[PDB]
Amino acid sequence: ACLSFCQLQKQQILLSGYINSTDTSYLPQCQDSGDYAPVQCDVQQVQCWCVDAEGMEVYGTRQLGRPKRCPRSCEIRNRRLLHGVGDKS
Amino acid sequence: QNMLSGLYNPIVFSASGANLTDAHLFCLLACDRDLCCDGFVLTQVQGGAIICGLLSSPSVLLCNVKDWMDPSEAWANATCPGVTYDQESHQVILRLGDQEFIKSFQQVYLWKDSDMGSRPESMGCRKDTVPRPASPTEAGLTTELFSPVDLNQVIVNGNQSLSSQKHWLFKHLFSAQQANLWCLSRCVQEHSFCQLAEITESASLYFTCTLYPEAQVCDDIMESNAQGCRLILPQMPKALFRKKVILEDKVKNFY
Ligand SMILES: *[C@@H]1O[C@H](CO)[C@@H](O)[C@H](O)[C@H]1NC(C)=O
Ligand SMILES: *[C@@H]1O[C@H](CO)[C@@H](O)[C@H](O)[C@H]1NC(C)=O
Ligand SMILES: *[C@@H]1O[C@H](CO)[C@@H](O)[C@H](O)[C@H]1NC(C)=O
Ligand SMILES: *[C@@H]1O[C@H](CO)[C@@H](O)[C@H](O)[C@H]1NC(C)=O
């Protein structure tokens, strides 16, 4: 058994808040499968946003606490197309 | 409840068996025998600590009881009420400033109209010193961030509830051009509340900066041009200015 990309980052943020001892107000909340949960925020749970399954934050969906639904991989690509990053189809 | 400029004789006292009525009877009679007061202020902070500070030629009078005062903020940028409610188990100590900027029931309240007029250094107590001549590379550039409105579009109701911040701008300091320039620069300082800034003259002492949201209601018909709808204000102003919309890329919502 080895460690998923979530729990790589959740240890790397937390000991950086322990070696440097400066706290960072974000730690991921991935599920049993290892990949990220779609909704992501910190312990205070004031701004919970939807995230891509690879890890990068989906730009625009920073709600104030709870997304009812998260965009999936088509609707992100279908809307960024309509903003205009190439490939008009 | 605030002046931002001009405060004479802060007679700081309290009631301990008397009441705040006689405090109003106290400092009203102080303004019947000189020229160096045009109004006064009457405060209270959680009981007891009251102020009768007298007003000699204020620049503005800002932050009405009937405005919009919930940006969810206190004690840090709370220059609009003037009070800074602190929590080092402070709870007792009265403290006063220079614009009734109190460091602590809240009944702050103010009076007006001595029908003033004076002479330079004759009966002279408060003069409007350091008038801040703004640079035209900064003052002349904010006037193109906004846009005038043809006043045929706005109609009056006087009856639709429309939240708004209000100001006085007395004519002895602010000129006709500086009446706009303070009110338009005040509209920039409220980054999301101001869309309509107006200047009106209902009596001959002052100007009036009244900041509005976008008061452009529109009917239910689905037509292209916006000619079928217009503005509604409680009174018809002399001038009117729009904070023109600055849309930015990288949209902040997933519609
Ligand atoms: C903080 O802690 C990390 C732990 O890997 C270390 O590499 C780094 O030198 C420390 N200091 C700074 C200034 O980042
Ligand atoms: C002030 O008002 C209280 C009631 O609120 C009353 O008991 C008291 O006698 C009043 N004192 C004076 C001096 O009017
Ligand atoms: C007031 O608001 C400004 C703009 O957001 C901010 O830079 C400033 O820090 C605030 N004041 C205080 C005392 O936090
Ligand atoms: C305001 O509207 C009400 C009806 O909603 C009407 O009865 C009243 O006379 C109006 N007042 C003015 C000043 O127009």
What are the residues facing A62 on neighbouring strands?
A49
Q: Which ligand has the nearest atom to the CA of B158?
A: 4
3-state secondary structure of B30: helix
Residue type, B181: L
Cα(A3)–Cα(B95) distance, integer angstroms: 58
| In contact, B160 and B255? CB cutoff 8 Å | no
Q: Residue B157, exposed/middle/buried by CB under 10 A (0-12, 13-18, 19+)?
A: exposed
Nearest to B180 by CA among B144, B215, B155: B144
Cβ of residue A85 lying under 6 Å from some atom of ligand 1: no
| In contact, B100 and B83? CB cutoff 8 Å | no
DSSP type of residue A5: H
Nearest to B107 by CA among B166, B25, B29, B20: B20
Q: What is the CA radius of gyration of chain B?
A: 21
Q: What is the resolution of this structure in A?
A: 3.6
Cα(B192)–Cα(B91) distance, integer angstroms: 33
3-state secondary structure of B42: strand
- The alpha-helical segments, DSSP class H, found in B64-157 are 139-142
Nearest to B65 by CA among B157, B203, B163, B212: B163
Nearest to B5 by CA among B99, B131, B116: B99
Cα(B213)–Cα(B194) distance, integer angstroms: 5
Cβ of residue A19 lying under 6 Å from some atom of ligand 1: yes
Q: Which residues of B11-31 are buried (b: 16+ CB within 10 A; e: fewer)?
A: eeeeeeeeebeebbebbeeeb
How many beta-carbon pairs below 8 A join chains A and B? 14
Residues of A whose CB is below 8 A from B251: 60, 83
Cα(B132)–Cα(B93) distance, integer angstroms: 35
Cα(B212)–Cα(B229) distance, integer angstroms: 18
Q: Which ligand has the nearest atom to the CA of B47?
A: 2
| In contact, B78 and B54? CB cutoff 8 Å | no
Nearest Cα residue to atom 5 of ligand 3: B77
| Other Cβ atoms within 10 Å of A35 Cβ, number | 14
| In contact, B196 and B183? CB cutoff 8 Å | no
In A32-84, which ranges are E strands? 39-40, 49-51, 57-62
| Other Cβ atoms within 10 Å of A46 Cβ, number | 10
Q: Terminal CA-to-CA distance of chain B, rounded, Å?
A: 42
What are the residues facing B109 on neighbouring strands?
B42
Cα(B28)–Cα(B156) distance, integer angstroms: 37
> Which of B14, B16, B19, when mutated, tests ligand 2's pocket best, judged by the most ligand atoms within 8 Å of its CB?
B19
Residue B1 tokens, joined: 């409840």
Residue type, B59: S
Ligand 1 nearest-atom number relative to CA A19: 2
Nearest to B199 by CA among B79, B60, B91, B52: B60
Q: What is the largest CA-CA distance in chain A?
A: 49
| In contact, A39 and A66? CB cutoff 8 Å | yes
CB nearest to B252's CB, from A60, A71, A83: A60
3-state secondary structure of A79: helix
In A1-86, which ranges are E strands? 39-40, 49-51, 57-62
Cα(B212)–Cα(B90) distance, integer angstroms: 37
DSSP type of residue B29: G
| In contact, B205 and B171? CB cutoff 8 Å | yes
